[PDB]
């Protein structure tokens, strides 16, 4: 089975700025991976992205009842669906779990949190480190939780106190974990 | 606050495979089981607070299948070029001996949306507790996907995530072992 | 709450 494949994609996109106060809507049609025609709520019509989509733009712009739905989708679709799942999408908060373990390298493992906006800090003796700090970045687990690992390149001395501090919108006060000699 | 909701559809000939899913900020709200004509929620809790009439998704799929046939001919039957996936295997939590964990096989940056994923332990297939997602849209219009395997870490077990894709010359093996 | 489907347009 080496038969050729042909792929149609459609992405209906709702972009929200400051809650639902500015909303941009995109009705996007793709052939394999090539976008060929789109409706932008900021434009008001379908526009061909490539010459392959020029027939569809000209025909759909003639369907006034079709345009009336797209031109109203910011209200009838975007803002509507935003409200429908707000309580478990926009408002979802999950606590991060924080674990510190030695890897001359210390790792701070922050796991299982939502949403992704997070700040992780390393402290040595009450001072925040900036050299020898590398982070995996935001890692999506695929199940509405993130994880992120933050390494500290340090020379552990006796008596030194290392502290990992996590700031996250689900927390009213940062979480801290300490590692000593 | 910046947020993006996407209703993402594809249709694939000649496999006749269609998919319909909602994306929030890169996560799946739900997809429609095309065979059972049912809404499947990514998290069970979602089905307690919202609902969806699936026949809207089936309608869009029938339309996409008809559009694809017209577009195939308008492109002079130009087919898709396969893009092989990148595969990475990680855990969702730091590993400790005999403490329950989950292996995550991340299949990313590929098209068309067809794969065969297999979990191996010590070179033998394993299926206990496995689960997987549907094909997830990327902003470059390729696909990604997760497969999961709950497991108890040991020093004596080794694991592999084996993915098959038409863009690969041989099955790709991503290896994982304790420490 | 009930999610809305945005419809895909039909060519030709």
């Amino acid at each position, epitope marked *: 089975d080496t038969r050729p494949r042909f792929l149609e994609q459609v992405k209906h996109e709702c972009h929200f700025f400051n809650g639902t106060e500015r909303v941009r809507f995109l009705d996007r049609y793709f052939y394999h991976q090539e976008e060929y025609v789109r409706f932008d709520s900021d434009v008001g019509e379908y526009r061909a992205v490539t010459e392959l989509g020029r027939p569809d733009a000209e025909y759909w712009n003639s369907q006034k009842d079709l345009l009336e739905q797209k031109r109203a989708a910011v209200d009838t679709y975007c803002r509507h669906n935003y409200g429908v799942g707000e309580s478990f999408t926009v408002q979802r908060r999950v606590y991060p779990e924080v674990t510190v373990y030695p890897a001359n390298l210390l790792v701070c493992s922050v796991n299982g949190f939502y949403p992704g906006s997070i700040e992780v800090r390393w402290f040595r003796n009450g001072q925040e480190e900036k050299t020898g700090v590398v982070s995996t970045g935001l890692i999506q687990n695929g199940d509405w939780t993130f994880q992120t690992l933050v390494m500290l390149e340090t020379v552990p001395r006796s008596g030194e106190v290392y502290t990992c501090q996590v700031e996250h919108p689900s927390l009213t006060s940062p979480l801290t974990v300490e590692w000593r000699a | 606050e910046e947020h993006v909701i996407i209703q993402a559809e594809f249709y694939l000939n000649p496999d006749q495979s269609g998919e319909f899913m909602f994306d929030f900020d890169g996560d799946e709200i739900f997809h429609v089981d095309m065979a059972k004509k049912e809404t499947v929620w990514r998290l069970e809790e979602f089905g307690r607070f919202a609902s969806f009439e699936a026949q809207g998704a089936l*309608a869009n799929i029938a339309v996409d299948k008809a559009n694809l046939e017209i577009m195939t001919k308008r492109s002079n039957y130009t087919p898709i070029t396969n893009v092989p996936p990148e595969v990475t295997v990680l855990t969702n939590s730091p590993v400790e001996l005999r403490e329950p964990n989950v292996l995550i096989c991340f299949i990313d940056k590929f098209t068309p949306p067809v794969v065969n994923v297999t979990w191996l332990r010590n070179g033998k297939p394993v299926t206990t507790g496995v689960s997987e997602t549907v094909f997830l849209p990327r902003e470059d219009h390729l696909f990604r996907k997760f497969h999961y395997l709950p497991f108890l870490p040991s020093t004596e077990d080794v694991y592999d995530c084996r993915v098959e894709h038409w863009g690969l010359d041989e099955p790709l093996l991503k290896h994982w072992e304790f420490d | 709450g009930v999610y809305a*489907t945005r*419809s895909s347009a039909v060519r030709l």
Partner: T-cell receptor, first 115, second 113 residues
Framework: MGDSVTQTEGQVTVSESKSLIINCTYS????????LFWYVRYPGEGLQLLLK?????QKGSSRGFEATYNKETTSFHLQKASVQESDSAVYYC???????????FGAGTRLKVIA | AAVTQSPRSKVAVTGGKVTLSCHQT?????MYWYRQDTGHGLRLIHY???????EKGDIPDGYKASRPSQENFSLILELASLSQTAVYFC????????????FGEGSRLIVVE
């Protein structure tokens, strides 16, 4: 406890050049974002669209009729300042969900215009 | 003009087969068969959004549908019953029209014993 459109029951008789108001409110549990419709069926003829509104807060008007899509009170009352002899028909209030098959119809209101 | 159905009137006996035809010239994807009762309003019997396939509506008992092409949607009454006397309305719609319904002229059916 589902989907329903409640209309003015039975017939309604109005004299020429006089005002009209037909009640329509709705309650949905399986619709997403309704569009609201008035359909009219003149004697002998079949059903035909009189007016429609897509987004809440706005009104449609045709042939001197008017109706406002009001999401605050989930109503779609049909009104006309001066009724004509040609306005004798059965008026149906309806909502549909543009992304699927669903439609909910009211029970219909008959208008009798007299001298 | 857009949607036409036939016959406009029929009188049939109980236990007899009655089929109502419906044709549309708008290339629409949806077709529906409704029943019009004075006290109940307009109830959906069967609908179709793709050719060669039929979905059952809210009151499909005693009726059967068939959609052999994109332009035709028939309603078959295998054994006509007294309870099936009403005015039957066919309709079409398509996304390109925002799924507004278009109705035919109506089929008034009376069944007697």
């Amino acid at each position: 406890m589902g989907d329903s459109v409640t209309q003015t029951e039975g017939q309604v008789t109005v004299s020429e050049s006089k005002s009209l108001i037909i009640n329509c409110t709705y309650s949905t549990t399986s619709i997403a974002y309704p569009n609201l419709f008035w359909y009219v069926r003149y004697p002998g003829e079949g059903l035909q669209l009189l007016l429609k509104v897509i987004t809440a807060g706005q009104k449609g008007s045709s042939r001197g009729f008017e109706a406002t899509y009001n999401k605050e009170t989930t109503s779609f009352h049909l009104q006309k300042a001066s009724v004509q002899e040609s306005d004798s028909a059965v008026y149906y209030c309806a909502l549909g969900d543009t992304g699927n098959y669903k439609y909910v119809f009211g029970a219909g209101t008959r208008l009798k215009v007299i001298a | 003009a857009a949607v036409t159905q036939s016959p406009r009137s029929k009188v049939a006996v109980t236990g007899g087969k009655v089929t109502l035809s419906c044709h549309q010239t708008n290339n629409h994807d949806y077709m529906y068969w409704y029943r019009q009762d004075t006290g109940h309003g307009l109830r959906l019997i069967h609908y179709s959004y793709v050719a060669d396939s039929t979905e059952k509506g809210d009151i499909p008992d005693g009726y059967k549908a068939s959609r052999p092409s994109q332009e035709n949607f028939s309603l078959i009454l295998e054994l006509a019953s007294l309870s099936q006397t009403a005015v039957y309305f066919c309709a079409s719609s398509a996304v390109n029209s925002g799924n507004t319904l278009y109705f035919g002229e109506g089929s008034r059916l009376i069944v007697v014993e």
